[PDB]
Design a protein around this ligand. Structure first.
Ligand code: GTS
Ligand code: GTS
Lengths: 208, 209
Protein backbone atom coordinates (compact mmCIF):
# COMPACT_ATOMS: atom_id res chain seq x y z
CA UNK A 1 0.00 0.00 0.00
CA UNK A 2 1.12 3.57 -0.67
CA UNK A 3 1.20 6.30 1.98
CA UNK A 4 1.65 9.98 1.13
CA UNK A 5 2.85 11.89 4.17
CA UNK A 6 5.36 14.07 6.01
CA UNK A 7 6.80 12.89 9.35
CA UNK A 8 6.40 16.38 10.74
CA UNK A 9 2.65 16.11 10.16
CA UNK A 10 0.95 15.03 13.46
CA UNK A 11 -2.03 13.48 11.63
CA UNK A 12 0.48 11.68 9.39
CA UNK A 13 1.94 10.02 12.46
CA UNK A 14 -1.15 8.05 13.46
CA UNK A 15 -1.05 5.45 10.66
CA UNK A 16 2.76 5.19 10.87
CA UNK A 17 2.55 4.17 14.49
CA UNK A 18 -0.42 1.92 13.73
CA UNK A 19 1.41 0.14 10.89
CA UNK A 20 4.33 -0.77 13.17
CA UNK A 21 1.90 -1.87 15.85
CA UNK A 22 0.06 -4.22 13.50
CA UNK A 23 3.30 -5.14 11.81
CA UNK A 24 1.96 -3.65 8.58
CA UNK A 25 4.57 -2.52 6.06
CA UNK A 26 3.89 0.75 4.24
CA UNK A 27 5.51 2.11 1.10
CA UNK A 28 6.30 5.59 2.38
CA UNK A 29 6.29 8.42 -0.13
CA UNK A 30 7.37 11.79 1.23
CA UNK A 31 4.97 14.42 -0.05
CA UNK A 32 5.33 18.17 -0.43
CA UNK A 33 1.78 19.56 -0.42
CA UNK A 34 3.18 22.91 -1.57
CA UNK A 35 4.71 21.53 -4.75
CA UNK A 36 2.39 22.28 -7.71
CA UNK A 37 3.77 19.14 -9.33
CA UNK A 38 3.11 16.91 -6.31
CA UNK A 39 -0.33 18.36 -5.54
CA UNK A 40 -1.70 17.40 -8.97
CA UNK A 41 -0.78 13.72 -8.74
CA UNK A 42 -2.04 13.67 -5.15
CA UNK A 43 -5.24 15.41 -6.22
CA UNK A 44 -5.84 12.78 -8.92
CA UNK A 45 -6.14 10.43 -5.94
CA UNK A 46 -7.50 12.69 -3.22
CA UNK A 47 -9.23 15.89 -4.50
CA UNK A 48 -8.84 17.62 -1.14
CA UNK A 49 -5.14 16.97 -1.70
CA UNK A 50 -4.20 16.59 1.96
CA UNK A 51 -1.87 14.23 3.77
CA UNK A 52 -2.03 11.62 5.03
CA UNK A 53 -3.47 9.73 2.07
CA UNK A 54 -3.50 5.95 1.78
CA UNK A 55 -3.69 3.94 -1.44
CA UNK A 56 -4.21 0.23 -0.83
CA UNK A 57 -4.88 -2.30 -3.59
CA UNK A 58 -6.01 0.77 -5.56
CA UNK A 59 -8.48 1.86 -2.86
CA UNK A 60 -7.96 5.44 -1.67
CA UNK A 61 -8.43 6.65 1.90
CA UNK A 62 -7.69 10.06 3.39
CA UNK A 63 -8.18 11.68 6.81
CA UNK A 64 -5.84 10.03 9.34
CA UNK A 65 -8.80 8.77 11.36
CA UNK A 66 -10.28 7.05 8.29
CA UNK A 67 -6.87 5.61 7.41
CA UNK A 68 -6.34 4.20 10.89
CA UNK A 69 -9.78 2.58 11.16
CA UNK A 70 -9.45 1.09 7.68
CA UNK A 71 -6.08 -0.43 8.55
CA UNK A 72 -7.34 -2.02 11.78
CA UNK A 73 -10.43 -3.50 10.13
CA UNK A 74 -8.42 -4.66 7.14
CA UNK A 75 -5.18 -5.87 8.76
CA UNK A 76 -5.57 -6.29 12.51
CA UNK A 77 -5.67 -9.92 13.60
CA UNK A 78 -7.94 -8.90 16.48
CA UNK A 79 -10.40 -6.15 17.46
CA UNK A 80 -8.58 -4.99 20.58
CA UNK A 81 -7.59 -1.70 18.90
CA UNK A 82 -11.19 -1.00 17.82
CA UNK A 83 -13.57 -3.06 20.03
CA UNK A 84 -16.91 -4.22 18.59
CA UNK A 85 -18.85 -3.82 21.82
CA UNK A 86 -20.92 -0.74 20.87
CA UNK A 87 -20.56 0.45 24.50
CA UNK A 88 -16.77 0.54 24.18
CA UNK A 89 -16.51 1.64 20.58
CA UNK A 90 -18.68 4.70 21.24
CA UNK A 91 -16.03 5.81 23.73
CA UNK A 92 -13.30 5.34 21.10
CA UNK A 93 -15.37 7.21 18.52
CA UNK A 94 -16.21 10.03 20.90
CA UNK A 95 -12.48 10.39 21.60
CA UNK A 96 -11.62 10.30 17.89
CA UNK A 97 -14.05 13.09 17.07
CA UNK A 98 -12.86 14.81 20.24
CA UNK A 99 -9.34 14.60 18.84
CA UNK A 100 -10.08 16.23 15.48
CA UNK A 101 -12.82 18.63 16.54
CA UNK A 102 -11.64 19.79 19.94
CA UNK A 103 -8.18 18.86 21.22
CA UNK A 104 -5.99 18.93 18.13
CA UNK A 105 -8.06 21.75 16.67
CA UNK A 106 -7.15 24.16 19.45
CA UNK A 107 -3.54 22.93 19.47
CA UNK A 108 -3.11 23.38 15.74
CA UNK A 109 -4.52 26.92 15.89
CA UNK A 110 -1.94 28.13 18.42
CA UNK A 111 0.86 26.40 16.53
CA UNK A 112 -0.16 27.95 13.21
CA UNK A 113 -0.17 31.38 14.86
CA UNK A 114 3.01 30.70 16.83
CA UNK A 115 4.69 30.07 13.48
CA UNK A 116 3.31 33.30 12.07
CA UNK A 117 4.96 34.60 15.25
CA UNK A 118 1.78 36.16 16.64
CA UNK A 119 0.36 36.21 20.17
CA UNK A 120 -2.53 33.76 20.68
CA UNK A 121 -5.43 35.57 22.36
CA UNK A 122 -5.53 35.21 26.15
CA UNK A 123 -8.64 33.15 25.46
CA UNK A 124 -7.53 30.67 22.79
CA UNK A 125 -5.28 29.21 25.47
CA UNK A 126 -8.40 28.76 27.57
CA UNK A 127 -9.97 26.39 25.05
CA UNK A 128 -6.54 24.78 24.70
CA UNK A 129 -6.07 24.28 28.44
CA UNK A 130 -9.75 23.34 28.58
CA UNK A 131 -9.21 20.68 25.94
CA UNK A 132 -6.36 19.17 27.96
CA UNK A 133 -8.44 19.25 31.15
CA UNK A 134 -10.93 16.95 29.43
CA UNK A 135 -8.15 14.60 28.32
CA UNK A 136 -6.69 14.68 31.85
CA UNK A 137 -10.05 13.34 33.05
CA UNK A 138 -10.31 10.68 30.34
CA UNK A 139 -6.98 9.23 31.42
CA UNK A 140 -7.90 9.41 35.08
CA UNK A 141 -11.03 7.27 34.86
CA UNK A 142 -9.00 4.69 32.94
CA UNK A 143 -5.34 4.02 32.13
CA UNK A 144 -6.00 4.44 28.40
CA UNK A 145 -7.83 7.01 26.26
CA UNK A 146 -11.10 5.18 25.64
CA UNK A 147 -10.76 1.82 27.37
CA UNK A 148 -8.86 -0.17 29.97
CA UNK A 149 -6.34 -0.99 27.21
CA UNK A 150 -4.73 0.66 24.15
CA UNK A 151 -7.04 1.59 21.23
CA UNK A 152 -6.66 3.68 18.05
CA UNK A 153 -7.89 6.57 20.20
CA UNK A 154 -4.59 6.43 22.12
CA UNK A 155 -2.56 6.45 18.90
CA UNK A 156 -4.33 9.51 17.50
CA UNK A 157 -4.40 11.40 20.81
CA UNK A 158 -0.71 10.63 21.31
CA UNK A 159 0.18 12.44 18.11
CA UNK A 160 -1.88 15.45 19.06
CA UNK A 161 -0.41 15.74 22.55
CA UNK A 162 3.24 15.19 21.57
CA UNK A 163 2.58 17.97 19.03
CA UNK A 164 2.43 20.33 21.99
CA UNK A 165 6.22 20.33 21.47
CA UNK A 166 6.09 23.04 18.80
CA UNK A 167 4.65 25.40 21.36
CA UNK A 168 6.23 25.18 24.78
CA UNK A 169 3.49 23.68 26.90
CA UNK A 170 4.35 22.62 30.43
CA UNK A 171 2.71 19.26 31.12
CA UNK A 172 3.46 19.48 34.85
CA UNK A 173 -0.17 20.33 35.68
CA UNK A 174 -1.31 17.18 33.89
CA UNK A 175 0.22 14.16 35.73
CA UNK A 176 -2.25 11.61 34.35
CA UNK A 177 -1.57 12.81 30.82
CA UNK A 178 2.12 12.37 31.58
CA UNK A 179 1.57 8.89 33.02
CA UNK A 180 -0.63 8.06 30.01
CA UNK A 181 1.93 9.30 27.45
CA UNK A 182 4.68 7.13 28.93
CA UNK A 183 2.39 4.09 29.06
CA UNK A 184 1.18 4.46 25.47
CA UNK A 185 4.58 5.17 24.00
CA UNK A 186 5.85 2.18 25.98
CA UNK A 187 3.60 0.07 23.73
CA UNK A 188 4.57 1.63 20.41
CA UNK A 189 7.19 -0.53 18.61
CA UNK A 190 10.24 1.35 17.32
CA UNK A 191 8.95 4.44 19.13
CA UNK A 192 12.30 5.86 20.27
CA UNK A 193 13.63 6.02 16.69
CA UNK A 194 10.35 7.58 15.62
CA UNK A 195 10.57 10.12 18.43
CA UNK A 196 14.07 11.24 17.43
CA UNK A 197 13.32 12.06 13.79
CA UNK A 198 10.04 13.73 14.62
CA UNK A 199 11.76 15.67 17.38
CA UNK A 200 14.72 16.60 15.20
CA UNK A 201 12.68 17.36 12.08
CA UNK A 202 10.51 19.92 13.89
CA UNK A 203 13.46 21.96 15.15
CA UNK A 204 14.61 21.92 11.53
CA UNK A 205 11.27 23.41 10.50
CA UNK A 206 11.79 25.93 13.29
CA UNK A 207 15.30 26.61 11.99
CA UNK A 208 13.37 28.75 9.51
CA UNK B 1 -32.90 6.73 26.11
CA UNK B 2 -32.51 10.42 26.93
CA UNK B 3 -31.40 12.91 24.30
CA UNK B 4 -30.25 16.31 25.54
CA UNK B 5 -30.52 18.61 22.56
CA UNK B 6 -32.03 21.58 20.74
CA UNK B 7 -33.33 21.55 17.16
CA UNK B 8 -31.60 24.89 16.62
CA UNK B 9 -28.30 23.05 17.02
CA UNK B 10 -27.29 21.52 13.64
CA UNK B 11 -25.19 18.77 15.27
CA UNK B 12 -28.25 17.61 17.28
CA UNK B 13 -30.42 17.08 14.19
CA UNK B 14 -28.43 14.05 13.03
CA UNK B 15 -29.58 11.72 15.82
CA UNK B 16 -33.14 13.04 15.47
CA UNK B 17 -33.34 12.23 11.75
CA UNK B 18 -31.51 8.93 12.12
CA UNK B 19 -33.87 8.05 14.98
CA UNK B 20 -36.88 8.54 12.70
CA UNK B 21 -35.36 6.46 9.93
CA UNK B 22 -34.80 3.46 12.24
CA UNK B 23 -37.85 3.64 14.51
CA UNK B 24 -36.01 4.51 17.72
CA UNK B 25 -37.84 6.22 20.55
CA UNK B 26 -35.89 9.17 21.88
CA UNK B 27 -36.91 10.72 25.20
CA UNK B 28 -36.14 14.29 24.14
CA UNK B 29 -34.80 16.76 26.67
CA UNK B 30 -34.61 20.32 25.35
CA UNK B 31 -31.38 21.71 26.72
CA UNK B 32 -30.07 25.26 26.85
CA UNK B 33 -26.35 24.57 27.14
CA UNK B 34 -25.87 28.24 27.96
CA UNK B 35 -27.94 28.07 31.14
CA UNK B 36 -25.49 27.54 34.04
CA UNK B 37 -27.97 25.39 35.95
CA UNK B 38 -28.52 23.15 32.92
CA UNK B 39 -24.83 23.35 32.05
CA UNK B 40 -23.77 22.00 35.44
CA UNK B 41 -26.43 19.30 35.23
CA UNK B 42 -25.30 18.09 31.80
CA UNK B 43 -21.67 18.07 32.96
CA UNK B 44 -22.39 15.31 35.47
CA UNK B 45 -23.24 13.07 32.50
CA UNK B 46 -20.92 14.63 29.89
CA UNK B 47 -17.83 16.35 31.36
CA UNK B 48 -17.66 18.36 28.14
CA UNK B 49 -21.28 19.42 28.56
CA UNK B 50 -22.14 19.76 24.89
CA UNK B 51 -25.27 18.73 23.00
CA UNK B 52 -26.13 16.37 21.51
CA UNK B 53 -25.63 14.02 24.46
CA UNK B 54 -27.30 10.59 24.50
CA UNK B 55 -27.88 8.32 27.52
CA UNK B 56 -28.90 4.74 26.65
CA UNK B 57 -29.55 2.64 29.78
CA UNK B 58 -26.95 4.60 31.72
CA UNK B 59 -24.44 4.38 28.87
CA UNK B 60 -23.56 8.00 28.08
CA UNK B 61 -22.53 9.12 24.57
CA UNK B 62 -21.66 12.47 23.02
CA UNK B 63 -20.50 13.94 19.70
CA UNK B 64 -23.33 13.75 17.17
CA UNK B 65 -21.11 11.40 15.19
CA UNK B 66 -20.45 9.01 18.05
CA UNK B 67 -24.16 9.03 18.95
CA UNK B 68 -25.12 8.40 15.33
CA UNK B 69 -22.73 5.49 14.80
CA UNK B 70 -23.77 4.07 18.17
CA UNK B 71 -27.52 4.02 17.41
CA UNK B 72 -27.06 2.47 13.98
CA UNK B 73 -24.82 -0.32 15.30
CA UNK B 74 -27.15 -0.85 18.25
CA UNK B 75 -30.56 -0.48 16.59
CA UNK B 76 -30.19 -0.66 12.80
CA UNK B 77 -31.92 -3.75 11.42
CA UNK B 78 -29.62 -3.23 8.43
CA UNK B 79 -26.07 -2.05 7.85
CA UNK B 80 -26.91 -0.04 4.72
CA UNK B 81 -26.71 3.31 6.56
CA UNK B 82 -23.27 2.22 7.72
CA UNK B 83 -21.88 -0.55 5.43
CA UNK B 84 -19.54 -3.17 6.90
CA UNK B 85 -17.34 -3.46 3.80
CA UNK B 86 -14.12 -1.58 4.71
CA UNK B 87 -13.89 -0.42 1.09
CA UNK B 88 -17.20 1.43 1.48
CA UNK B 89 -16.99 2.32 5.17
CA UNK B 90 -13.72 4.17 4.58
CA UNK B 91 -15.52 6.69 2.37
CA UNK B 92 -18.34 7.17 4.89
CA UNK B 93 -15.82 7.60 7.69
CA UNK B 94 -13.76 10.00 5.61
CA UNK B 95 -16.83 12.05 4.66
CA UNK B 96 -17.78 12.21 8.35
CA UNK B 97 -14.37 13.61 9.29
CA UNK B 98 -14.74 15.93 6.34
CA UNK B 99 -17.94 17.19 7.96
CA UNK B 100 -16.73 17.88 11.46
CA UNK B 101 -13.27 19.08 10.47
CA UNK B 102 -13.74 20.70 7.07
CA UNK B 103 -17.22 21.79 5.98
CA UNK B 104 -19.06 22.40 9.23
CA UNK B 105 -15.93 23.83 10.86
CA UNK B 106 -15.68 26.52 8.21
CA UNK B 107 -19.43 27.20 8.32
CA UNK B 108 -19.80 27.57 12.08
CA UNK B 109 -16.60 29.63 12.18
CA UNK B 110 -18.29 32.17 9.90
CA UNK B 111 -21.53 32.05 11.89
CA UNK B 112 -19.67 32.61 15.17
CA UNK B 113 -18.13 35.78 13.76
CA UNK B 114 -21.38 37.12 12.34
CA UNK B 115 -22.73 36.47 15.83
CA UNK B 116 -20.02 38.70 17.35
CA UNK B 117 -20.69 41.31 14.66
CA UNK B 118 -17.36 40.57 12.97
CA UNK B 119 -16.48 39.69 9.38
CA UNK B 120 -14.88 36.62 7.79
CA UNK B 121 -11.60 37.27 5.99
CA UNK B 122 -11.36 36.55 2.26
CA UNK B 123 -9.36 33.46 3.19
CA UNK B 124 -12.17 32.14 5.36
CA UNK B 125 -14.80 32.63 2.65
CA UNK B 126 -12.41 30.93 0.24
CA UNK B 127 -12.00 27.81 2.38
CA UNK B 128 -15.77 27.89 2.85
CA UNK B 129 -16.07 27.74 -0.93
CA UNK B 130 -13.29 25.18 -1.10
CA UNK B 131 -15.15 22.84 1.23
CA UNK B 132 -18.31 23.19 -0.83
CA UNK B 133 -16.60 22.48 -4.15
CA UNK B 134 -15.36 19.28 -2.55
CA UNK B 135 -18.82 18.30 -1.32
CA UNK B 136 -20.06 19.29 -4.77
CA UNK B 137 -17.58 16.79 -6.28
CA UNK B 138 -18.56 14.10 -3.77
CA UNK B 139 -22.22 14.32 -4.77
CA UNK B 140 -21.35 14.12 -8.47
CA UNK B 141 -19.17 11.02 -8.40
CA UNK B 142 -22.18 9.38 -6.73
CA UNK B 143 -25.81 10.29 -6.03
CA UNK B 144 -25.07 10.22 -2.29
CA UNK B 145 -22.43 11.60 0.09
CA UNK B 146 -20.34 8.44 0.48
CA UNK B 147 -21.96 5.69 -1.58
CA UNK B 148 -24.54 4.58 -4.13
CA UNK B 149 -27.16 4.90 -1.39
CA UNK B 150 -27.95 6.91 1.75
CA UNK B 151 -25.66 6.46 4.76
CA UNK B 152 -25.01 8.26 8.04
CA UNK B 153 -22.79 10.54 5.96
CA UNK B 154 -25.75 12.00 4.12
CA UNK B 155 -27.68 12.65 7.32
CA UNK B 156 -24.81 14.55 9.02
CA UNK B 157 -23.87 16.56 5.92
CA UNK B 158 -27.53 17.45 5.41
CA UNK B 159 -27.53 19.06 8.84
CA UNK B 160 -24.35 20.93 8.03
CA UNK B 161 -25.46 22.25 4.66
CA UNK B 162 -28.90 23.54 5.67
CA UNK B 163 -27.09 25.43 8.44
CA UNK B 164 -25.82 27.67 5.64
CA UNK B 165 -29.29 29.22 5.82
CA UNK B 166 -28.25 31.53 8.67
CA UNK B 167 -25.75 33.15 6.32
CA UNK B 168 -28.09 33.34 3.34
CA UNK B 169 -25.14 31.70 1.61
CA UNK B 170 -25.95 31.27 -2.08
CA UNK B 171 -25.92 27.64 -3.21
CA UNK B 172 -26.80 28.62 -6.77
CA UNK B 173 -23.23 27.82 -7.84
CA UNK B 174 -23.56 24.34 -6.33
CA UNK B 175 -25.91 22.32 -8.63
CA UNK B 176 -25.21 18.81 -7.38
CA UNK B 177 -25.47 19.86 -3.75
CA UNK B 178 -28.93 21.28 -4.44
CA UNK B 179 -29.96 18.11 -6.26
CA UNK B 180 -28.43 15.95 -3.52
CA UNK B 181 -30.38 17.94 -0.91
CA UNK B 182 -33.77 17.04 -2.41
CA UNK B 183 -32.73 13.38 -2.70
CA UNK B 184 -31.79 13.02 0.96
CA UNK B 185 -34.70 14.94 2.43
CA UNK B 186 -37.10 13.01 0.19
CA UNK B 187 -35.75 9.98 2.04
CA UNK B 188 -36.03 11.38 5.57
CA UNK B 189 -39.41 10.35 7.12
CA UNK B 190 -41.74 13.38 7.33
CA UNK B 191 -39.00 15.91 6.56
CA UNK B 192 -41.15 18.99 5.91
CA UNK B 193 -42.58 18.43 9.37
CA UNK B 194 -39.09 18.22 10.89
CA UNK B 195 -38.02 21.33 9.03
CA UNK B 196 -41.15 23.11 10.27
CA UNK B 197 -40.47 21.85 13.77
CA UNK B 198 -37.02 23.39 13.51
CA UNK B 199 -38.55 26.66 12.34
CA UNK B 200 -40.99 26.73 15.25
CA UNK B 201 -38.30 26.01 17.80
CA UNK B 202 -35.89 28.57 16.39
CA UNK B 203 -38.68 31.13 16.64
CA UNK B 204 -39.57 29.98 20.15
CA UNK B 205 -35.89 30.26 21.03
CA UNK B 206 -35.30 33.71 19.57
CA UNK B 207 -38.45 34.50 21.56
CA UNK B 208 -36.43 33.78 24.69
CA UNK B 209 -34.54 36.95 23.76
N1 GTS C 1 -7.99 15.97 9.26
C1 GTS C 1 -6.89 15.71 8.36
C2 GTS C 1 -5.87 16.84 8.52
C3 GTS C 1 -4.66 16.68 7.57
C4 GTS C 1 -4.02 18.02 7.20
O1 GTS C 1 -4.44 19.10 7.62
N2 GTS C 1 -2.98 17.89 6.39
C5 GTS C 1 -2.21 19.03 5.90
C6 GTS C 1 -0.73 18.92 6.20
S1 GTS C 1 -0.25 18.93 7.94
O2 GTS C 1 -0.63 20.18 8.56
O3 GTS C 1 -0.88 17.86 8.66
O4 GTS C 1 1.17 18.79 7.95
C7 GTS C 1 -2.32 19.06 4.41
O5 GTS C 1 -2.39 17.99 3.78
N3 GTS C 1 -2.33 20.27 3.85
C8 GTS C 1 -2.42 20.38 2.41
C9 GTS C 1 -3.75 20.84 1.96
O6 GTS C 1 -4.62 21.07 2.81
O7 GTS C 1 -3.90 20.95 0.74
C10 GTS C 1 -6.35 14.35 8.78
O8 GTS C 1 -6.40 14.01 9.96
O9 GTS C 1 -5.90 13.61 7.92
N1 GTS D 1 -18.84 18.05 17.79
C1 GTS D 1 -20.00 18.20 18.63
C2 GTS D 1 -20.44 19.64 18.56
C3 GTS D 1 -21.68 19.97 19.43
C4 GTS D 1 -21.62 21.38 19.98
O1 GTS D 1 -20.67 22.15 19.75
N2 GTS D 1 -22.69 21.71 20.71
C5 GTS D 1 -22.81 23.04 21.31
C6 GTS D 1 -24.13 23.75 21.02
S1 GTS D 1 -24.55 24.14 19.29
O2 GTS D 1 -23.58 25.03 18.72
O3 GTS D 1 -24.63 22.98 18.46
O4 GTS D 1 -25.82 24.78 19.33
C7 GTS D 1 -22.74 22.93 22.80
O5 GTS D 1 -23.33 22.02 23.39
N3 GTS D 1 -22.03 23.88 23.38
C8 GTS D 1 -21.89 23.91 24.81
C9 GTS D 1 -20.46 24.06 25.21
O6 GTS D 1 -19.60 24.13 24.32
O7 GTS D 1 -20.25 24.11 26.41
C10 GTS D 1 -21.02 17.23 18.09
O8 GTS D 1 -21.03 16.96 16.88
O9 GTS D 1 -21.79 16.73 18.88
Amino acid sequence: MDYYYSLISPPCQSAILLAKKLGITLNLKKTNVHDPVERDALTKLNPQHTIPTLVDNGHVVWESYAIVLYLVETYAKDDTLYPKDPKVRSVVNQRLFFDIGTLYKRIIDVIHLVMKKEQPSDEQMEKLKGALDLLEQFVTERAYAAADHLTVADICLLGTVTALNWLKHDLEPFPHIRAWLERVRAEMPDYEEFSKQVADDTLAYVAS
